[PDB]
């Protein structure tokens, strides 16, 4: 019973009805401006933005700002990646990161290809096809120069045609027909462009801004190699995604798109080749930071998701997996099942806290996580004061830690320079779980220490 | 520039001009009811509950829930304790430790003694003095019986008459004549009975529920042995408190009570000889539990602005201490000035937080701290977000914690059962101190990322 | 210069005239009597022992106990090694390692293929090629049954012929024609049998017992992926090793073996296809245990030395290393040269230790090492004294800890039972480096605390 | 059945009839030379040293270098030790520390007043009580000045003559007529000088120089507040120790010195009034440094049996305490007897060790502990070798440590210059004892592997 938004234009009716979109018509400088009014957005927990008149390019392309920030619905925070995840807009936190787990056990769903789409009516070619024609966005004061791509799509494909990748990566604008970003070698575009490097031929790749809202999640998320990411989308919403065929590069692309930038990597430069458009083009942007942006919401969410899938593929009984907000996706949360040591006869706390560690260890996503806190699912990790609580009154101040040293977040904060520079550092275990206890003994609240009648004659009474 | 509020009359008319008090006029039963209606106010941060009508009293003695929740009053979630300590209702975390602290280096200003007081309108002796007239809330369905003192103040003097300490303790009721409470030898309450037990004769007691609210905070305070409470009172308002003669024992209480419990304390039973009460007396509870409740607001709150002050006068370049309420009073942030390292020349970060250990160490707050974090004074410890945002990026995983191994808080939940039973186990200093940063290498927001004309203008087009 | 021990007579010979030889003439039993001689003489560091007559078959088989224990040898314990290694008796724990690790650098040397050795002056083949004509020590009490391989090589090759690896692993009999021992995926022998698996055919192998002193010394040794044994204990002795083919395998065997037991491993059974050995054969055992036996003396220390050359592979500025024989090969020493910081500019003493943590970790022997001491060249870490004396006054007792956890020695004691029930723990890295101290604020004796006249002349006084 | 020796003159001819005493009739000059000699004989384990020449005096005052080293003896290194505790030469490092530990039980021995003493068979008083008659070691090369005193013992007494200190503190030659040393405030010599102080009178002193052996094992014992060394030392002889009465002071010392030096502690100077002396004087000295001297043979050794005692006071089953010479005093082992847990129902390994943490703290040798490991008593703590293997194989790498931080040794080498400066650091506590193990499966050796029958007929072809 999925309830899946097709392209970006029924995302924000859905987000327009329950008002947590609106528009400004007033210019706006795409030079820090934009990116301010991003910021202002979701530290302020405002409504998404759609701004309509952009300083240098007027009213040809749009942006949308906080296009999966918390949103202004009330009651229901988690209503733009509920939505862009085709859930309802109430869905929890666990109700969204166990929808995504339960897609991880499900065979791909191979997509289809249509011979037109709306992201193909405009089309730029030769020394038409230049990106001085569309905003450029300063996003923050010491930034390099324009982040063209923050959360559009970059798909590539191994030169055999056997494989296709899709990930969001930020893309930097040197000028109208050259772009630049990093090419990490942990990531699956650093992977596949090394391929393309050893037979001595440019990528051929394209850029996708302003799809269906879930595709953005998908492609942030650390599926294992050899997953693709439209096959993983076509298992999630129980049908095959539409894609259409690339106008200069042979490449497959979502038919959903506002914009389509192609081109190839030379040997790392992107060069555009063709941008296409569907008619009033939007260009969604994300601007990251300090909480709660799409880092946060769309990247260390998926991550909690397949952190959540692994646990669960190594029969280790995992209630939730969270990545809080708060901590910058600098944090994974895992809680057990109140049954645990029922279905894990043969070890203590200690013990699955090990295994933990053990398993996370021989995943990808491993050097993401700073910290692994281990607790008892009577915690609501996505609550901040919960699982603040929690971890102050079931943390040992100094046991009950396993630390491991390896390869680190190059972007996390709590590493020193030497730590970072020579790319190895700690990263800590915590183990939170209790021993068998009454739930009166560890809970002192309305719900947990009043009897039901008790708690109904007081919600009569006050609420 | 203080607002002292005079009585409970005074705080009640001041939290109704707010709409942050509600009445209930229904029957409610303190046998588990008032104890769930307050805390369902302490959790939904609801209006402090005025109880108007109990059962098995009736309206005789009302009962007030939640008298120093978080507030209502848009804004200004700590508008009860600003209130309580005479600051403006929008004063922040900072301020109100910030004045609690520099009353610590002020001069104690002597009580006064009244002839009479509306706390002593009625007057019961003897066989009257009967406990059963009045209200015993059964708070938690676990309890061993009604707890009668949450919120009061304990009065008791040495056996000379030359020192009186105010103490909030937990006292349960017996029957209609006698209560009982825990005497813990590290707590004022404690060492004077031990003196009282000496000489072989009962200390004579008094319990205050109701006073003007600025007492209960300076009564939960953990002042340092041989400074009164009334004295510190009397110059963080910068005027003297009035006090009035108990009827049947020689000690002096707040002339602003509601009711006044007087007796002697037997070889640990209090025995009640007299209890005086002003006309529709109020009788506050304290309904402790999870957060956020008065043991955090409070207790945790002036033990921080304690902290504060002991930091301060060992010379520390404090600019803030905090216990952040998600933590369950289990945790102490210390901020330290911008300009410490110029204040402190001969010291790294591990030092000033070696320093910072050895202080807190020789202190009586000590064994409270579970956790102590160390950070700069660009984080606001009472901002949840901001908080837990600036220890998952600052606190290394591994390194920078100094454990010290000794006394503990029995009520604190991160400990073993070994550890508890012996009264003995750890409690960490966690250095979260960065090195010398530009403001934009450790900041990504609104606020700290975007020139001034481009925050006004983008302010100018949202708020 | 080396000096060479071409055969085991050769090297008895000369521990022979060091009076480092005791022959037993008395009949000693295999079971339990030839171990239980064996450890004694470890433990009270005695002659190595000719066990001449042996229960069961006489003097037809002679058993050589201690191989490679700690010397009688006046002022040189670790004659055995050095000898063994072709160096002076006297050669010191850095020399021998900085001989080993000095040969890491240098092109392997292809071995000879001679025509006859006296390995094959008698051939049993058939039903003669029974293990029931040689000794069958029971070394232990608890033991599954007799260990027949402590001490010799164990010769495998890839079944393509293009590599050859010599192991020593321990193996125990089942019959007379039957042996088994575990094949561990981590190890060459194990890696080599997998490939033997998936061809579905018998793995030929031959075992070789008392060859030059040399061979289970580099078989020992946990050399690369792709490294033969035999280049490098070619390209250390500076000439080739010379090799027999074996009667019924094809595979080369050491010339100087005095017993060869050739084979195919079944799919882990050793069949037995033929025992070659020369006139009067001496069958070396190792008694492994607590310290101080050939685990500590060949295996821990080449372990040591293959550590050495791997750090100053790295560009590492490291002066030494040794596994100290009383921390039972569990323990790493990284002694660094006294001007690291001259060659190493840009890092911290908990840089270099990083440092030295990341290099470990990436090779096939970061799992033995249960701690790793990081220490500075003043300390010589093969004086037991010294060294314990550097860790207690160098090394803090809380701070300048790594902890990496992963997979760990099974065989480690320092383990919980969960922890090696998952093969999966910590290992620690120890920082006992000083900052920059004069001689005399870091040393107090005789050596280092009085100038050369005032020794000279004490040492005219007393020695 | 205490052999106890009566002065330095009995104890010299026991060491002489064991070949552990040499005299050197050659001059030594007391610049530099008689501390290298002392040195030299330390670390190469020689005969105590009988200077009888020395530049500057002649044969005047002789000096006794390495009075409590260990011992030439063979098979008895703390020979010297046992025989100044009247032990018999060959005591175990276990019987000498239960011995003193056995005497802390036992009710205090009142002193005997002799009239006469052979330490005054000559008096100088006045201008001829000067100290450049008799040598002025200049022990190393960077030391202050000449310390007279390394071995002898400081005696004082409270202001009402009730108390009497008797110490080993380190005291230096200013000129002929004052001496200086630091008084501790921890210290007993220094509490007492305190006392002194406040009445604002000069405290009169005397140090003692060769009295009967014994004495500097208990002048250096850290025995609890109120407890009188001689008294102590009466209990453990079993007998009145003699005292006679100094010449100037109202101070009484032991009749059985070599040397008397008389005089009253300036407001710290102290300023000699009188020297006695017995014919033919020797003066001991102490040469302080790396192992082995008396800091770790008397006074780390003392201090283990002192912790031992405190330990079993608090009904610790504890087998035995050991400060290993190997970790300079910096260490203690804590032995549990094998039947422990019986002993202690109720606590698991880890709150044992907590317990035995929570003990040492309150005590006033717990500065000293930089390490304390907890064993089990399989292991003989002074077996340098099985010591080092017990903990490389019994103590995690990560858990099993308990960290307190507080007062630290300022002579400890294992702490920051920040640490030392504030004087507040880590100290550990180790766990290393095992769960529940048969001896087979914790230990591998010639006395724990093999039966009886086995041993003894290894031990009649070997032995
Ligand atoms: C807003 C946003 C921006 C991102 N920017 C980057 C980036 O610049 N580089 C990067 O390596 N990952 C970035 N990520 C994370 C990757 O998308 C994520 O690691 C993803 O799994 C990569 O795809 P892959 O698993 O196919 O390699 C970003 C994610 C989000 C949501
Ligand atoms: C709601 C509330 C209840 C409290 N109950 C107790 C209690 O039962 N026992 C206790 O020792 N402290 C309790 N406290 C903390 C003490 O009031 C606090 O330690 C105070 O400083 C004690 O007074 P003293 O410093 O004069 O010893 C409570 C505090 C609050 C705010
Ligand atoms: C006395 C002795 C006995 C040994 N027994 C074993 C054994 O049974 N199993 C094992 O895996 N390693 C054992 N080793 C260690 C291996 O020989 C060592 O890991 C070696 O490097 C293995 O060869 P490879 O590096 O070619 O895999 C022993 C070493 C010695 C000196
Ligand atoms: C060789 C030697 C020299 C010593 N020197 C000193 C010293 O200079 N200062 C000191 O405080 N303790 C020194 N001690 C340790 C003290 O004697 C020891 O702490 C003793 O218990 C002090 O006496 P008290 O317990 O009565 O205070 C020395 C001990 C020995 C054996
Ligand atoms: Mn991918
Ligand atoms: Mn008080
Ligand atoms: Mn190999
Ligand atoms: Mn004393």
Same mark, same amino acid.
């Given at each position: ?78 209503? +733009? ?25 499900? =065979? ?61 990566? +930020? ?40 799809? =269906? ?25 129980? =049908? ?123 995943? !990808? ?76 003994? !560890? ?21």
């Amino acid at each position: 019973s999925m309830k899946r938004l097709k392209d970006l234009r029924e995302y924000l009716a859905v987000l327009e009805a329950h008002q947590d979109v609106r528009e400004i018509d007033e210019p706006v400088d795409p030079h820090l401006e934009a990116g301010a009014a991003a910021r202002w957005t979701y530290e302020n927990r405002g409504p998404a933005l759609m701004l309509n008149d952009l300083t240098g390019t007027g009213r040809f392309c749009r942006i949308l700002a906080a296009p999966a920030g918390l949103s202004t619905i009330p009651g229901s925070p988690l209503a +733009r990646v509920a939505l862009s995840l085709g859930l309802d807009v109430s869905a929890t936190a666990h109700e969204i990161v166990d929808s995504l787990a339960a897609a991880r056990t499900r =065979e791909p769903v191979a997509p289809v290809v249509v011979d037109s789409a709306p992201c193909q009516d405009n089309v730029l070619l030769g020394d038409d096809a230049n990106l001085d024609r569309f905003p450029a966005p300063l996003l923050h004061e010491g930034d390099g120069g324009p982040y063209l791509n923050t959360w559009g799509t970059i798909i590539v494909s191994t030169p055999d045609g056997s494989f296709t990748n899709w990930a969001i990566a +930020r893309v930097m604008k040197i000028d109208g027909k050259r772009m630049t970003g990093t090419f990490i070698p942990t990531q699956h575009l650093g992977q596949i462009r090394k391929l393309w490097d050893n037979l001595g031929q440019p990528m051929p790749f394209a850029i996708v801004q302003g799809t =269906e809202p879930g595709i953005p999640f998908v492609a942030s998320m650390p599926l294992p190699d050899g997953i693709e990411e439209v096959g993983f989308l076509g298992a999630y919403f129980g =049908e095959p995604l539409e894609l259409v065929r690339a106008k200069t590069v042979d490449l497959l692309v979502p038919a959903s798109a506002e914009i389509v930038i192609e081109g190839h990597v030379m040997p790392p430069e992107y060069v555009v080749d063709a941008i296409t458009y569907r008619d009033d083009p939007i260009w969604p942007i994300s601007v990251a930071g300090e909480p709660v942006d799409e880092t946060h919401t769309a990247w260390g969410l998926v991550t909690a998701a397949e952190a959540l899938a692994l646990l669960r593929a190594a029969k280790l009984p995992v209630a939730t997996a969270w990545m809080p907000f708060e901590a910058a996706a600098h944090w994974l949360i895992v809680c057990l099942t109140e049954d645990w040591r029922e279905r894990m006869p043969g070890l203590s706390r200690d013990g699955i806290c090990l295994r933990i560690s053990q398993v996370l260890a021989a995943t !990808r996503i491993e050097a993401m996580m700073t910290r692994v806190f281990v607790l008892d699912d009577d915690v609501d990790p996505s609550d901040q004061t919960e699982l603040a609580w929690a971890i102050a009154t079931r943390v040992s101040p100094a046991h009950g830690r396993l630390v491991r040293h390896g390869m680190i977040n190059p972007l996390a904060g709590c590493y020193s320079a030497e730590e970072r520079r020579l790319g190895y550092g700690p990263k800590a275990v915590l183990n939170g779980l209790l021993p068998p206890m009454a739930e009166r003994s !560890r809970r002192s609240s309305f719900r947990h220490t009043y009897p039901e009648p008790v708690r109904q004659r007081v919600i009569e009474l006050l609420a």
